[PDB]
């Protein structure tokens, strides 16, 4: 067989230990999911420094907590805009997930609160910036560098899926790099509790699984497809399926054809053909062996999964960092004042926040 006795025993034991970890983690998650945290700070506790990113509902700002001097990333959402854009459930769900999960590669929610106008989620500040920026700048990541990041996503999805959470928005734009060079997954706006199937068309065109495009009921396997897209894009510098317009991207995704750069190793191409598998009965992460088909693949043979989890592996890349409030790994955005109104705008809708 592929393993002698010692290696087979060690692998079996490791896999049973994962099961034991996940059972405890699910019990802890369910306690917090049923009793969420609320109203742990207020706006005048922080100085607002600089906008780090923007979205349709609001912005993320670097803030400094006055009493402690600690920096955080504050997501500000305008309640009226959230309602106008039909995002009430997603916004409440994102906060509920963030306060209930706990994993070393998932960004932590440190405080949350609301006022007349806005919702506020104060998260750890992740100072290395977006993987997207580093990838476009460097061009591509070497296979060991891509693998280091991929391993963190594998573990994070193994965790989330054990909780029956599907993530649904993996892409470099949503992965931040911390001061030690490890990933922080951000943005749970599309994540959903799904033990069976779900049907919403959501995600980003290049990262959509075929079954989403084809309007089928789908499951956690869409995240394993997206991992394939991510690994490909990290290692190539461009994603496997692209075109001028989304419809042409979708035709390529559903085709069952994918082409690889000549510098991809055979092990990498094998992994990617098994992740980017249109046929759900054949896609890695969706078979009887579950996540183990991925973790035990030859491309990951050098990966020490526990060492990655414990953050004891030396990162391939440490972002530039001048000090606690350095924002040099984020872009510059036009700044706009935050206006709190005498509207209790949309109080009923956001009672649970």
């Amino acid at each position: 067989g592929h393993m002698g006795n010692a290696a087979a025993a060690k692998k079996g034991s490791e896999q049973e230990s994962v099961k034991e970890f996940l059972a405890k983690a699910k019990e802890e998650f369910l306690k917090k999911w049923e009793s969420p945290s609320q109203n742990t700070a207020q706006l005048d506790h922080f100085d607002r420094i600089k906008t780090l990113g923007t979205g349709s509902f609001g912005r993320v700002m670097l803030v400094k907590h006055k009493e402690t001097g600690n920096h955080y990333a504050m997501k500000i959402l305008d309640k009226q805009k959230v309602v106008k854009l039909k995002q009430i459930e997603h916004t409440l769900n994102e906060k509920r997930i963030l306060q209930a999960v706990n994993f070393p590669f998932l960004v932590k929610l440190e405080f949350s609160f609301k006022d007349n106008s806005n919702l506020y989620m104060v998260m750890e500040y992740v100072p290395g910036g977006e993987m997207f920026s580093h990838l476009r700048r460097i061009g591509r990541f070497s296979e060991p560098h891509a693998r280091f990041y991929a391993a963190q996503i594998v573990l994070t999805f193994e965790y989330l899926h054990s909780l029956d959470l599907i993530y649904r928005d993996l892409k470099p734009e949503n992965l931040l790099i911390d001061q030690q060079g490890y990933i922080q997954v951000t943005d749970f706006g599309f994540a959903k509790r799904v033990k069976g199937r779900t049907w919403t068309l959501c995600g980003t065109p290049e990262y959509l699984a075929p079954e989403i495009i084809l309007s089928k009921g789908y499951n956690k396997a869409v995240d394993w497809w997206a991992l394939g897209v991510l690994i490909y894009e990290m290692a190539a510098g461009y994603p496997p399926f692209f075109a001028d317009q989304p419809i042409q991207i979708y035709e390529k995704i559903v085709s069952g054809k994918v082409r690889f750069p000549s510098h991809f190793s055979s092990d990498l191409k094998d992994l990617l053909r098994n992740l980017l598998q249109v046929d759900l009965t054949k896609r890695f992460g969706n078979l009887k062996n579950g996540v183990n088909d991925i973790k035990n693949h030859k491309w990951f043979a050098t990966t020490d999964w526990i060492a990655i989890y414990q953050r004891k592996v030396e990162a391939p890349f440490i972002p530039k960092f001048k000090g606690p409030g350095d924002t040099s790994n984020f872009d510059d955005y036009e700044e706009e004042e935050i206006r709190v109104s005498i509207n209790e705008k949309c109080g009923k809708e956001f009672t649970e926040f």
């Binding site: 349709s56 854009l85 995002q87 997207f132 476009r136 928005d169 892409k171 734009e173 706006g189 599309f190 068309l201 959501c202 995600g203 980003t204 065109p205 290049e206 510098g237 461009y238 692209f242 075109a243 001028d244 082409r259 750069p261």
Partner: peptide
């Protein structure tokens, strides 16, 4: 080349979700 085709797509910047 494939890279040139990627540049030609115009989708080299940050990509929005469908929402």
């Amino acid at each position: 080349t494939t890279y040139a085709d990627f540049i030609a797509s115009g989708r080299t910047g940050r990509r929005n979700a469908i929402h």
